[PDB]
Design a protein around this ligand. Structure first.
Ligand code: MET
Length: 529
């Protein structure tokens, strides 16, 4: 029994925030939310990666001091995530003094167990990705302007040769112990094919890792290696330590950090239950990170879910090349909950998704408006629900027991998808049941039963309300604002809107009064063809 701990990756602050970071954090936010809906202590963590050469030089380009720059951008991030209506507990910055204490404390652990030694790194490097790459992983390409140069195959960004005396981590010694972990825990990297990638890599062989860099190279914009001011710590070790730092910070209601604890157990968050990340940063989390943690004798995480990169109208995203995709703007256009749904629904973690205003409307009209929207407006109209209450149900037909089974079985299958995690599958799961409820309703024809057979209408309405309820509960994390509006319409008491107990069918007693119906309001609004 522990605080469920879920992360988004801390984002480089070299440019403004955009869909990549928003999507990543939404997943994190959703996973966190669901576990809270369960009624569990949760700790969600997003943040910014502010040190290193990439950011140091991005500051230099705009021609302002990095101290000013990083605080400026971090602000654009805090603003945007605040606009997206997330429920992240704390927002972490690698410039934070408590974080340094941790980073240094972690360093010394690695040093005291003798897994750090002074060496050299002579090889390729991407500043834009802050990644060490072998000659096999680089190719010919084009300079930021004219000239021929070498680029990364992974990312297409320029690589420079580096020949520095660095401090070296014995990553090569943790190959065998990594492969046991990949096996021992064969659902610890999601999705499965990304797990096969990681194993295949570690199987080939692992070099040692440069965990320090010549102070000059970095423009002194990093964390000093303990005992040697000539060096600074690899921006990635710095960043990967964010998870441990955040696990150790007591946090006030205003959201400001108020204290760094000595030991990770004191807050019961570490090790992270889930690390949400993107495909592009897999090796750091799936190879380096566990190797570090093993070295330092800390526990390893439970799950790492890597996702893909987005597009718009089948063309990659770029502010400069004619195809932008501003989430705060599209959220203001179509609705914040609606946009989150689309992003979570349209593409699963094994896929590089495709937004378009066409499909956004298709799914908004088809699913949000027509499936779910009509269902809540039906079972709560004056027309069908003449007493504005939860009716007491008569005897159940087999076709009733049929639907009830779905509704009963739904929580458990959604629990699994949410836990994998596979948020797409979980949404579909729910909607299958919503579709099933709209069939049952069309078939029972309650509009007609209000005059023919009120004793029967009681059993239909009840099942429909309880269906809509349980489905809405399990969509809570996806549609946080709209689920509340739904629950209000239904008149579901606040105690019943959360908690594992209210997954069970029949948790709201009959006689429960519905919410006051406002005439002007709809739940979802259709858009043009
Ligand atoms: C601690 S995970 C770091 C992620 C990295 N800063 C990025 O934005 O890709």
């Amino acid at each position: 029994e522990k605080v469920f701990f879920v992360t988004s990756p801390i984002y480089y602050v070299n440019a403004a925030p955009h869909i990549g970071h928003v999507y990543s954090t939404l997943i994190t936010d959703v996973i966190g939310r669901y576990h809270r809906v369960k009624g569990e202590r949760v700790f969600a963590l997003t943040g910014t990666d502010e040190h290193g050469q990439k950011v140091a030089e991005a500051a230099k380009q705009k021609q302002v001091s990095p101290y000013d720059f990083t605080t400026a951008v971090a602000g654009e991030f805090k603003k945007c995530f605040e606009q997206m209506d997330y429920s992240i507990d704390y927002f972490i910055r690698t410039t934070n003094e408590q974080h340094k204490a941790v980073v240094k404390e972690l360093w010394t652990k690695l040093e005291q167990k003798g897994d750090i030694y002074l060496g050299r790194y002579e090889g390729w490097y991407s500043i834009s990705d802050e990644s060490f790459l072998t000659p096999q992983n680089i190719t010919d390409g084009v300079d930021k302007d004219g000239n021929p140069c070498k680029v990364s195959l992974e990312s297409g960004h320029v690589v420079t040769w580096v020949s520095e005396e660095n401090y070296m981590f014995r990553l090569s010694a943790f190959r065998e112990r990594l492969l046991e972990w990949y096996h021992a825990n064969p659902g610890c990297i999601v999705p499965e094919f990304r797990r096969r990638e990681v194993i295949r890599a570690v199987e080939k062989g692992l070099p040692d890792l440069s965990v320090s860099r010549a102070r000059a190279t970095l423009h002194n914009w990093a964390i000093p290696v303990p005992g040697n001011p000539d060096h600074c710590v690899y921006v990635w070790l710095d960043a990967l330590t964010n998870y441990l730092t955040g696990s150790r910070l007591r946090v006030d209601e205003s959201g400001k950090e108020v204290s760094l604890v000595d030991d990770f157990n004191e807050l019961e968050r570490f090790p992270a239950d889930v690390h949400v990340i993107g495909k592009d940063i897999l090796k750091f989390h799936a190879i380096y990170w566990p190797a570090f943690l093993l070295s330092a004798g800390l526990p390893l995480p439970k799950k790492i879910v890597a996702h893909g990169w987005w597009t718009k109208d089948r063309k990659k995203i770029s502010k400069s090349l004619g195809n932008v995709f501003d989430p705060v703007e599209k959220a203001e256009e179509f609705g914040y909950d609606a946009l989150k749904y689309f992003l979570l629904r349209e593409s699963g973690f094994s896929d590089d998704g495709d937004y378009s205003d066409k499909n956004m409307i298709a799914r908004l009209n088809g699913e949000l408006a027509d499936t779910l929207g009509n269902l809540v407006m039906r079972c709560t109209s004056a027309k069908i629900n003449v007493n504005g209450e939860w009716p007491s149900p008569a005897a159940y037909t087999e076709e009733d027991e049929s639907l009830i089974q779905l509704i009963k079985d739904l929580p458990g299958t959604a629990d699994h998808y949410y836990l994998i995690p596979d948020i797409q599958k979980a949404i579909i799961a729910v909607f299958d049941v919503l579709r099933a409820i709209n069939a049952y309703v069309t078939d029972m024809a309650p509009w007609k039963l209000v005059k023919t057979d009120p004793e029967r209408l009681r059993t239909v309405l009840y099942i429909t309300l309880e269906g809509v309820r349980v489905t809405t509960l399990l969509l809570s994390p996806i549609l946080p604002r709209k689920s509340v509006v739904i629950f209000d319409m239904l008149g579901v008491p606040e105690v019943h809107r959360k908690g594992i107990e209210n997954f069970e069918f029949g948790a709201v007693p009959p006689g429960t009064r519905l919410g006051p119906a406002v005439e002007g309001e709809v739940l979802f609004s259709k858009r043009s063809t």
